[PDB]
């Protein structure tokens, strides 16, 4: 059964969200509308947290598609797990490492960077247009 709002506030009575009370209080008194219920503050905290979880997750999808290293790791995942499983004790190393070195300097040197040219497309899905040029001439 889909949860009614009173059940959600009764659960927010026990489990507070990530964004604490005073941040919600500052954004309240910045936008007017002084409210004295702590459960409405926790509900708006959970709503903002869920919305930015969705935006940052869509940024994660846009940053894992737009790199060849990630799609090649997803393609050759168990194919290189075969090579790792055949990477036994030292008799049995000479028949491997024909492909291990290049993706070794690719996959271990690649960290996932939340980028402006990634988030701008992840929120251009959501209605924005964050146009930052790449040089200024």
């Amino acid at each position: 059964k889909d949860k009614t709002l009173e059940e959600i506030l009764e659960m927010m009575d026990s489990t507070p969200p990530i964004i604490p009370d005073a941040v919600i209080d500052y954004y309240l008194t910045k936008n007017g509308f002084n409210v004295a219920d702590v459960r409405v503050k926790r509900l708006l905290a959970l709503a903002t947290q869920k919305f930015v979880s969705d935006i940052a997750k869509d940024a994660y999808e846009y940053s894992r598609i737009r790199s060849s290293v990630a799609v090649s790791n997803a393609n050759n995942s168990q194919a290189r797990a075969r090579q790792l499983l055949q990477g036994q004790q030292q008799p049995g190393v000479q028949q491997i490492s024909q492909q291990q070195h290049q993706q070794n300097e690719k996959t271990t040197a690649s960290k996932v960077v939340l980028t402006v040219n990634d988030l701008s497309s992840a929120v251009a899905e959501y209605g924005l247009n964050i146009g930052r040029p790449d040089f200024y001439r």
């Binding site: 919305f51 969705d54 994660y60 999808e61 894992r64 598609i65 737009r66 790199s67 060849s68 990630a70 799609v71 790791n73 997803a74 393609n75 995942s77 168990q78 797990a81 790792l84 499983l85 996959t107 271990t108 996932v112 929120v123 899905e125 959501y126 209605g127 924005l128 247009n129």
Partner: protein
């Protein structure tokens, strides 16, 4: 030209609801809607795959455009299970991984859009017109499954709004689908979601967006 896929459009209409021999105009409008949707799918997927640095469109690159509908991509994964690992998933962040007419109801479901060969599909939809490379590894099978889902969902909502317009007409004074039913089914299926609008609501500027694919 047009009117190439009329009998197959009728076959896919039969699986959703009753058929009652739909006219030339409904099949023509569904053909033009699907021909537009395929071009938009190919343009968005080619734009996504060129920036990776590979003109060959991968099979996962078109599942990228429908990544929100988890039930539909689970349906696609079960549909790819009779031919006898997504890059954006939770496991694939980290670097290393461990080790009597019921038969007539069924044969219409086996009838597909591009099941036979991609000969009429390639010059009808124009695969070579906008793709810079050679995408055909499994992009045609997904581009058949997506059009089957588009026609099924479109005639489902057109049937439901035809029934609701019927009860509105019999309540106002007190069989076939038309172009107006397909157009208002399109208007129902092309409304932007509320979460994909939230960040432009208090500022006043005309929302430019993309055609939502089913």
């Amino acid at each position: 030209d047009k009117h190439k896929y009329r009998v197959e459009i009728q076959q896919m209409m039969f699986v959703s609801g009753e058929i009652n021999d739909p006219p030339v105009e409904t099949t023509s409008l569904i053909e033009d809607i699907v021909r537009g949707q395929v071009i938009e799918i190919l343009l968005q997927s080619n734009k996504t795959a060129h920036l990776r640095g590979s003109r060959s469109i991968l099979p996962e690159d078109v599942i990228f455009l429908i990544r929100h509908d988890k039930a539909k991509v689970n349906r696609l994964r079960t549909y790819l299970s009779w031919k006898d690992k997504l890059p954006w998933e939770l496991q694939f962040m980290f670097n290393e991984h461990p080790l009597e007419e019921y038969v007539h109801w069924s044969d219409c479901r086996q009838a597909s859009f591009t099941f036979r060969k991609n000969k009429r599909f390639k010059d009808w939809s124009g695969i070579s017109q906008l793709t810079e490379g050679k995408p055909h590894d499994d992009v045609i099978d997904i581009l058949g499954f997506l059009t089957f889902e588009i026609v099924c969902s479109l005639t489902e909502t057109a049937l439901k709004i035809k029934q609701r317009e019927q009860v509105l007409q019999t309540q106002k004074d007190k069989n076939p689908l038309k172009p107006r039913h397909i157009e208002e089914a399109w208007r129902v299926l092309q409304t932007i979601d509320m979460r994909h609008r939230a960040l432009t609501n208090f500022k006043g500027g005309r929302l430019s967006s993309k055609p939502i694919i089913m």
